[PDB]
Amino acid sequence: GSHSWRHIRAEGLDSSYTVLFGKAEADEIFQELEKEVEYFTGALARVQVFGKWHSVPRKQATYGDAGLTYTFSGLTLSPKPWIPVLERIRDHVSGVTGQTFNFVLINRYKDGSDHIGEHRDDCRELAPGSPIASVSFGASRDFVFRHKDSRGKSPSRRVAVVRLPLAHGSLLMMNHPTNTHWYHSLPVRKKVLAPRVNLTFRKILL
Template sequence: MAAARARGSGKSRVGGMRRFGAKSARLRGGRGLPEGGAARHSACAFASRRPPPPSPFSPPPPRPPRRRWSFQGQQVLLPGGVTSLSWPPMDRYVVKRPHGEVGDGGGKRPRAERPAAGQPPWQEIRAEGLSCDYWLLFGKAEADVLFQQLEEEVEYFQGEMTKLRVFGKWHNIPRKQVTYGDPDLTYTYSGVTFSPKPWIPVLNRIRDRITSNTGHTFNFVLINRYKDGGDHIGEHRDDERELVPRSPIASVSFGACRDFVFRHCDSRGKNATRHIKPIKLQLAHGSLLMMKYPTNVYWYHSLPTRKSVLAPRINLTFRKVMTTGKK
């Protein structure tokens, strides 16, 4: 009787396992079964199937949400007046400018060179009272060559020219320093008046590249060499009276990447009147930072000590200095 019932239902027992016969396979999905049988048979068939292997064209699984960075108290100015408060650490102040646009809009200038293939465009760095442009001026290979030439050809000051007066006291400069420029120019910084040395070919090469990319000309450069992370420069503004009013300062960096920090004048020291977070940048090997007006009116900048940095860095700040008769 049991065997007859098994044959009649299309099922058989083999080794204690129940298997569906050909008839039940044809009836999957409910075709020819009484009401209720379709559900039972289709459910068993679905449970017995293995999940198909993932297709190479299947969409990837959803990614966990990324961490978003916010800059409290500062707004980043974007094209069209749009503001944003959530950017990655370096890019939070960066606004990409349209391709081909250079300078600060102050008059007609020579047409700038187009960036090389794969080279990122100009980037605008904006905050309250801060206006800077950032650019990778030299590729790595060319920057390496220029760095080596600077190491071999630049002659730094010695003796009394290596001291600065701070709060009435004389201190040794925690770095090497020298100035180059046009004849008959002078530049006074922290109580010391510098007379520039004549231009040398490597400096002319860098200066010409800046002019071809920005349209600005410069007649003076201050060079600082930091042998490692122990050498540094404190907070200061490049606002000396010898500078041409509202002229930009072009800062070119070679060598080790160091933190470059802007701090608003209203948020310095114990008597700060406002809480404005400092802006920290990392200037790449071969990069150009154009500090435009009114940055040096409202913001101090510094290169703080970083003991973990063991390699040297050379920074050149090209300036427009007034001639003696115009001061």
Template sequence: MDKFLVRGALKLTPEKRKHQPEEEDADCTNKKNETEEKRPTLPVAILDEPRRMHANPWREIRAEGLNCSYTILFGKAKADGLFQELEKDVEYFKGELTKLQVFGKWHNIPRRQVTYGDSGLTYTYSGVTFSPKPWIPVLERIRDQVQLATSHTFNFVLINRYKDGHDHMGEHRDDERELAPRSPIASVSFGARRDFVFRHGASRGRRALCRIEPVRLQLEHGSLLMMNFPTNRYWYHSLPSRKKVLAPRINLTFRNVMAA
């Protein structure tokens, strides 16, 4: 557990968990009569919770407006095999699809990227519209295992490959209009363990409206992180550079995308 979450997290019993803030409390800009000195800081809560059709316990991660679940979905031997299949079979985008738009300027993506999914779907973010490639067997097997473990269905996957700790992803929210309302995003990781950071939108920048501590996770080889509603409404997430990480990592984020 210490390698998974930052220090200072609280473990809650099911009875205490019901007292965690609901969605309407998540936007601290709506709170009244709060001075600079008395802005709230909410700790992170974790609850181990076994689920049907899945052997490992889930760790439920809660903060103000953040609702995530984490588990090890694939044991090491299985994860090793899937990683090798992904390295062999996944074909990443080239050319213009390797760029993104930030504040009106185009930049090379600091990682390799591709999308797979059902035919007829499109997905637009950072100024680029992606049409997914057809599913391949290794992705179908991973998707089916995720669906079995979560009871959610997914028709699209975004794959990011980080060659080492220099490759990274900046702060953003997965709140594109093509996503089905209130649908979760399932993030599966293979390869090197990497830090994953959530930051509340109202806590960003020098003129932050709240003081809500970032949530830092370490995503393990074979792990599954579920980003449930309303996480992407309030929280940004990133994968920071870590120069000491020398091994590659592949991340698959399964989504439910609406047809145009």
């Protein structure tokens, strides 16, 4: 150590995976997250894609420093003030990695039928070259990376997909230039009966 990483690498891809918490501690944090996080509803839970509007197949929330905003798929989200459980996770991640963050996005999947579609994390408000930290609690779910040049009907090349399960209590670091080159998603898994909560920490420009 101080930590033990599994490195995930391939053309233009640079990420790393590790387990931060044991089962007892991870169960405590999950219960506190279910008690305290406030999720967006109604008009703040609909997006526009290919000209049509949809309610998102999951629940979402945003927290962070004053003044920042976060915009994607026709939806603009404003961040709530930091709370203790979220400050504790942020500080632990900063200590382990040496990086700093001023914003967090939270996604909750109620069972295996809740999911999220393919995309890159590259909006203008992200500081150039900064990393993104992904922390998970609850049921294990499969996570998938796909190369931009390999997408669609007859693509330019065919780079193999990269798949890994994200377990209860784990951290995935996504480093530059991962998000200029690769899309990611969380597909439907019908045999999964229990809920999962995911947190992604970021550096946002004012």
